[PDB]
Structures are given as structure tokens and as C-alpha cells.
Amino acid sequence: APNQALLRILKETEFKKLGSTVYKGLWIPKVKIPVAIKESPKANKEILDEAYVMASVDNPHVCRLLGICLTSTVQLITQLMPFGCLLDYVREHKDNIGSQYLLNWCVQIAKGMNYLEDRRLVHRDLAARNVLVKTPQHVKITDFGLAKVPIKWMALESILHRIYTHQSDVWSYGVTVWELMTFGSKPYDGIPASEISSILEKGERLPQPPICTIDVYMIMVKCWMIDADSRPKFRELIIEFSKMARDPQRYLVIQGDDVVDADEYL
Numbered sequence: 309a310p311n312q313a314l315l316r317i318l319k320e321t322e323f324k325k326l327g328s329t330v331y332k333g334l335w336i337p338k339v340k341i342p343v344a345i346k347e348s349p350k351a352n353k354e355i356l357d358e359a360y361v362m363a364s365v366d367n368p369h370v371c372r373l374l375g376i377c378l379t380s381t382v383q384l385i386t387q388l389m390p391f392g393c394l395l396d397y398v399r400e401h402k403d404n405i406g407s408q409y410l411l412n413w414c415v416q417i418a419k420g421m422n423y424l425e426d427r428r429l430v431h432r433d434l435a436a437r438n439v440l441v442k443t444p445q446h447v448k449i450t451d452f453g454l455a456k457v458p459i460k461w462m463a464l465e466s467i468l469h470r471i472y473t474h475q476s477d478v479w480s481y482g483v484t485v486w487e488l489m490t491f492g493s494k495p496y497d498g499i500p501a502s503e504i505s506s507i508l509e510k511g512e513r514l515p516q517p518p519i520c521t522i523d524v525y526m527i528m529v530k531c532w533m534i535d536a537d538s539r540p541k542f543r544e545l546i547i548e549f550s551k552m553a554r555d556p557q558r559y560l561v562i563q564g565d566d567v568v569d570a571d572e573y574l
């Protein structure tokens with residue numbers, strides 16, 4: 309099927325500039341769009357591969373590409389996510405994240421990944437750092453630099469044979485949920501990356517997070533099966549976490565539980 313996605317090229321005089329470079333700015337084509345601008349031939353060839361992917365996806369739980377600017381430096385312009393990556397957010401707000409937010413985030417990430425699977429697209433880098441927060445009630449998947457290596461998030465098949473599937477993304481989804489349920493802990497913290505391949509082969513997995521019932525930890529374990537086709541599908545993960553979002557305290561035990569956004573500029 310032909311990929312009739314549009315690549316928008318923006319004037320540099322429309323922007324008015326966060327991490328290193330990514331910047332916070334406004335895009336004024338009477339409308340002001342809060343945006344994030346990201347400034348050798350290797351660098352330009354890879355950032356255009358990323359713009360190709362983001363321009364070809366359109367889903368409420370996937371980061372939208374607004375355009376590229378062709379100046380001395382190739383600049384990517386995306387929707388500004390004011391609350392950051394989900395990894396920093398869960399670390400800075402542990403004392404205030406409820407089970408409702410955690411389970412709903414798991415639903416939204418699975419929806420975004422299920423859409424990426426419909427697009428016949430493998431992310432290859434699903435992680436808590438690569439999930440941005442529009443509002444605490446709305447997250448989106450980002451960073452498609454490897455979307456067609458971080459060993460601690462990869463399936464065993466990706467480590468050994470460099471094989472990547474939608475089901476290897478499911479493994480990365482399992483680690484991402486584990487980062488959230490541990491409020492931002494580091495997977496296999498301390499263990500050198502060269503030893504991860506031996507550990508997984510022996511049968512060991514990431515531990516059960518303290519706030520997780522066996523229901524939630526069972527889903528993570530299923531994402532980490534050696535047999536990729538035995539791991540759950542993203543459409544099933546949506547269904548499972550959505551049921552748990554209807555009674556969150558039953559599955560997560562936690563103590564004390566003219567500016568227009570890009571989503572409206574279509």
C-alpha cells in the first residue's frame with residue numbers, strides 16, 4: 309500500500325525557541341503551537357529516517373510530527389509534551405502516583421503499540437524514557453530513531469539473533485511496565501549489559517514490584533517468555549489492563565492510594 313503521508317516543511321522564521329539539542333518553542337504559521345524543535349551526513353540521514361516514521365503515524369497515543377525545517381541543521385518539530393518523559397515523571401512524583409494513573413498509562417501505551425503494529429511497524433526501543441506525558445491523563449509513545457541497542461529492554465531473541473518483531477516489542481513493553489510499577493527503578497540495576505544474555509537464558513526475570521498483585525506481575529512474566537508467540541498481543545494487553553483500571557486498588561497496592569495544542573491543529 310502506498311504511503312501517502314505528507315511531509316511538511318516549515319519556515320525557520322515561524323519558530324521562537326530542554327535537553328542536549330531539543331528546545332521549547334512556539335510555532336506560529338492566528339495560531340500559536342507549543343512545539344519541541346530538535347536540531348555530519350550520518351546525523352542528517354538518521355534524523356530524516358525518524359521524520360519519515362513520525363510523519364507516517366497518526367494515533368492519539370503516538371507523538372505527532374508537525375514538520376521539519378531545512379536550515380543549515382535539519383530541525384524536527386514535534387508536539388510539546390509539557391510533563392516530560394514518563395520515566396522522569398514517575399521518579400519525581402512517586403509520593404503522588406495512584407494506581408488509577410499507572411493502570412491507565414499501561415492501557416494507553418498498549419493502545420499506541422497496537423496502532424504501531426497495525427502500521428506494520430516495530431519500535432525496537434520501547435522504554436519509560438521514550439513515553440512522553442502530555443497531561444498526567446494522556447501519554448504518547450515517542451523516539452522512533454530505531455523504528456523500522458538498549459540490552460536491558462530487548463527480548464532474548466533480539467540479543468542473540470538480532471531478530472525484532474512486534475512480539476519483541478511486547479518484551480520491551482513488559483520492561484516498561486516494570487519501570488512504572490517500581491516508580492522508575494533501573495532494570496537489572498548493577499548487572500553489566502554483557503551478562504544480561506546469560507541471566508535471561510538461565511530463566512531469571514525482573515523481580516515482582518512491591519505494589520504489584522500477582523495478576524499484574526503475571527502479565528509482565530507473560531511478556532518475557534522465551535517463545536515470542538506465547539507472549540500476549542498488544543490488543544490483549546489493552547483488554548487486560550482496561551479491566552484492572554476499573555478496580556485499580558484490587559491490582560495495585562499503594563500506600564495513600566491564541567495558543568492551541570497540536571492535537572487541535574489538524
Ligand SMILES: *CCC(=O)Nc1cc(Nc2nccc(-c3cn(C4CC4)c4ccccc34)n2)c(OC)cc1N(C)CCN(C)C
Nearest residue numbers: 326327328330344386387388389390391392393396440451
Ligand atoms: C526524560 C526526559 C524529558 O523528556 N524531558 C522533558 C521533555 C519535555 N517535552 C518534550 N516534548 C516533546 C519532545 C521532547 C523530547 C524529545 N527528545 C528526543 C529523543 C527524542 C528529547 C530529548 C531530551 C529532552 C526532551 C526531548 N520533549 C518537557 O516539556 C517542558 C520537559 C522535560 N523535562 C522534564 C526537562 C528536564 N529533563 C531532565 C530534561
